């Protein structure tokens, strides 16, 4: 549950090439969203006619929210309330929760954000925007601090309106629930003026009554409505019987939510809700387990694949990160930091390199290959790879397999049987072969996980050269043109290949209609 | 929305795939954005561009 | 701030009541925390002195005060009532933390009392009793008259009811008297953000979670904590568990940064057993590669009906009691009241099923009588009693008392944990007084209790002594294999002056004689061609 | 304080080691409880008594 849960984007003040795209991204990724998990960051909206009702129903971002170059007349978050500031937005000192920059918008309407929990507000070079002076940011930022003029002529604000006004009209007035209190509450917010009227110390922004169960969000945890100092423990400990038992009322703390079950996009681990799993445990069901034995090898994913990091993977069992293989990894590029400071130089490497990934089975992230090289054809290094998770995706389709403009011939990655949690983009791929065939859903976890093959190579063009599936695959498909590579066998299946019937390969007995295993029969 | 060059020794390294480089002082802290060639996105422009424009299957 | 342990006999009493009196004097005289249920049960005279309530601060369980008859209960300085134990009539009824009924006091008065933290409060046909109906339990307890005697209404001074006729006796208040901002805790001020931490139990001074009276849950650097400081603290803003240093152990209210060692160490706590899923393995509950091996739990009471369970175990989790009871049999009663099933009496020769446990993890008690019962060489490989429970307000982790024991016989018992030696009037017992306890004993804190057992000098004439070939460190028989330590050799738990002697032994150490390999007769050393 | 027999079940095979069932009714719910002969306490008076006033070794 919590409603509606969205990942965030970290890719910040960066320019996209293609303005349509953009939008189709931000619109697919807040649409029907209202708790947007890392940060909100709206950029390149040159379009006036742009809708932006995605944001309609936003109501609070753990992160940071930046606003860069959008020229829409009226940016309205309508419900957004309170933005936690957990990371905080700054340029290469000071450090932003709400940040708008280079935006030709009329008007910047939040009628509803009544809190920002940590860091700064700041505006700059926006031309046309209005009523920012008139909001008296001390009542909304957290510190309780003052936080950082137009051309055009600006409307008064209504007259409802005590102070001020994030627009026009009398539901666009700046609501108070920090400066309008009685002294008799100095470190709280009070929902009235009078002294009795003050809040719970754990409300963050407003509040409807006395009680921790009045807030309108929480300053600490939040269970169910309620806010609390700590979320109830999964195992409770018994100062009686000395012993630590297991408890039914028991919650996962997700950042500073309480919550039965958690986002597939976390594990659970000891009560509380992480991304990646410690070095003593094993993922196994969305839960962090206990290894039986030594712990299967899991190092971290990498942005991008070079030199430098390849050999890092070796004897890899699970890839807890994501997979990128660039033109850049084989020809090698120029690295930098966000110092701006020049970075090493990765001598270029050949795809044989590759062959280190055969030891995966999992990778936690995306796997994504845009590579280009004459020797790298196929995709056989992960030959071993039987599950990609989809608990971080790519920025664009919610990718977790995405193979875009690659020198790829086939794919011939068998053992595959699993793509949890993701969509599957396979376009452009001049000579790509099988991908058309291969019918994704089967590999796919939710049928509501999509698919988009489009652009490889022709269907017919690979049958005039043949490369298709063998006669011995059902309708399914397969990830290349070896008897071992189907996805399915239509008839007796066979150690990791496909046979007619078990009384070809001598030594076989039949335990099943659908495989054969080998001797030392019947 | 006035940007000026930057500096030839971060130019010619720092963008990637024939993108232009261009930087923007905000508050007389230049900050330095990579305008990209049509079909490649990312922050120095390293990525290749999706097309999701395209029906599901 | 001394601690005293409970009882929890109900309605019962010793037949004889001046007995009876004299044994809660004892109980809870200097008293200031009682672990456990307190019964001021059958004080049918008046005058008697009831000093031993003058010190009680708080109660972990209930209390129940039944048949009292003195004229006036005080208790000068309880303040607290967990109600982690209650007291109920019929398993389908109310539980109390709080329970007078059948006693003739004129006033009960509890001034200073604060917090009924779980469990409620009862009156019932107590004839003298008054000024209950004045006051205001929902004050006290967090959630759940007709006295026929003129009763003189509170002093002037309290504003709301009282508890006897001072105004010392006012009650006093922290809950209802509050802001509604505090909904789920206590006030020091009438004022809204002059509340204190939901961390504390009981009053508080002011709004920190060192201002409380009471804490809560755990104590730790004088400061009330809900959950002891984690061995690994969650990240809300990267989602990831790191690892501690100011991590601690959770270990009964208080917070410590080692265990106490005869305890279990379950991820965040300070344990008695490892729950199904985890098992024992060195000081740590790891969990289980694949199966985890069968526990064995120990019993209340052993008897007839349970020692089955018990074949075939290696550590006893929990406790042993073997009482007159288990010999000579028993009906049960179900939780309900209703009688259960009746179990045939026990024979001591079925003891045996204990001769494969190792370790105990509570307490060994041994109380039962019977002719055949005279040793405890059941317990032969049993070798530690770990003592992570202990019994009654000796503190005990090895009782025997009243057996009809001669001899213990427990060879290879070699070290209790944790907890008190205490064995008396075993009128029949030998070697008892002769054994240095301290040896077995971790700690030399720990202490021990040796009263009453069958006179060393009359266990000397019948030659019921140590052998020649034990120290001074005593034995647990009479026989070669009983030594504590061995006075010089030691072969295959027998303590030999020789190894020539046995023919088969060789030398091995100056404290040691191994047996020859099975090929040969005598050998110069410890080999199959070494003859 | 009115004290009667328990129902035979209980007055024969309630308590333990010689002891005797009374009864009370409180709240209108019977309660059976025992005195105990000497050395002997708990609520079947199934506990042999221990002598706290001897001093430790
Ligand atoms: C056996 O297997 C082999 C090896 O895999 C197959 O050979 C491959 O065949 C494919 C398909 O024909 C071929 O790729 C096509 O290349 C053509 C022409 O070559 C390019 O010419 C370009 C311009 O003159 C130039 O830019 C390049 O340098 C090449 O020399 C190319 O037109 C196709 O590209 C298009 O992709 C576009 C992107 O969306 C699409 O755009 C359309 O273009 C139309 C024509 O210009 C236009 O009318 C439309 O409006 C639209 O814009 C369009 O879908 C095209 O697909 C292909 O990329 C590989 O080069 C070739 N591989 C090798 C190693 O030679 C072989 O086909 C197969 N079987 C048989 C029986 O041969
Ligand atoms: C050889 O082994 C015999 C069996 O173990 C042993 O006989 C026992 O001796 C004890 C002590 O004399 C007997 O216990 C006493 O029983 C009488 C009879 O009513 C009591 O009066 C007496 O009262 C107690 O005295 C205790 C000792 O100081 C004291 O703890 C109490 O407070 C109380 O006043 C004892 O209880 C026991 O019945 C004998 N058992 C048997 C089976 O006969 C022999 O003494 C021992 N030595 C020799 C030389 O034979
Ligand atoms: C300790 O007492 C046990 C019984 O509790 C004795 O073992 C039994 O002794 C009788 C001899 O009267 C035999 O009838 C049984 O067959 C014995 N059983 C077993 C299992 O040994 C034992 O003799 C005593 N041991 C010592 C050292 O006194
Ligand atoms: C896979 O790729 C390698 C290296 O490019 C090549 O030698 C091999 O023939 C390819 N295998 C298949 C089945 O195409
Ligand atoms: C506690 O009571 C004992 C007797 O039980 C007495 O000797 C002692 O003086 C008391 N302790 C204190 C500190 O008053
Ligand atoms: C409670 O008593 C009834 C008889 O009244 C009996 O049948 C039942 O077994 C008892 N309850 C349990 C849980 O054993």
Known sequence: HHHKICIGTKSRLSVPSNKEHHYRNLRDRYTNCTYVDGNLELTWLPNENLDLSFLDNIREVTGYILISHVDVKKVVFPKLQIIRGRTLFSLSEEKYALFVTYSKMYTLEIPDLRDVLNGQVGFHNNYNLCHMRTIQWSEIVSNGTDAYAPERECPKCHESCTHGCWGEGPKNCQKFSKLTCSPQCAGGRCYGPKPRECCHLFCAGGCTGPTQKDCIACKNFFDEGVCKEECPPMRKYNPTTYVLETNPEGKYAYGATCVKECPGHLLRDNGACVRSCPQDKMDKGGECVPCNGPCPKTCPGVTVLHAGNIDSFRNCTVIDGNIRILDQTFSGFQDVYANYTMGPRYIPLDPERLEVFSTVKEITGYLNIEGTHPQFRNLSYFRNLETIHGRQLMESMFAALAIVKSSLYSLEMRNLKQISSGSVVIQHNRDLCYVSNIRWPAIQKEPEQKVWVNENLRADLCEKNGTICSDQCNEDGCWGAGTDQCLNCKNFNFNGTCIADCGYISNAYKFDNRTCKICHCN | ?57
Not at chain 2, 4 to 14: G, I, S
Not at chain 2, 43 to 57: G, M, S, V, W
Request: proline share 7%; glycine share 4%; hydrophobic share 35%.
């Open chain 2, 1 to 57: 929305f006035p940007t000026y060059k930057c500096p030839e020794t971060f130019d010619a390294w720092y963008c990637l795939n024939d993108a232009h480089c261009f930087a923007v002082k905000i508050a007389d802290l230049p900050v330095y954005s990579c305008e990209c060639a049509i079909g490649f996105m990312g922050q120095r422009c390293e990525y290749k561009e999706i097309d999701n424009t395209y029906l599901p299957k």
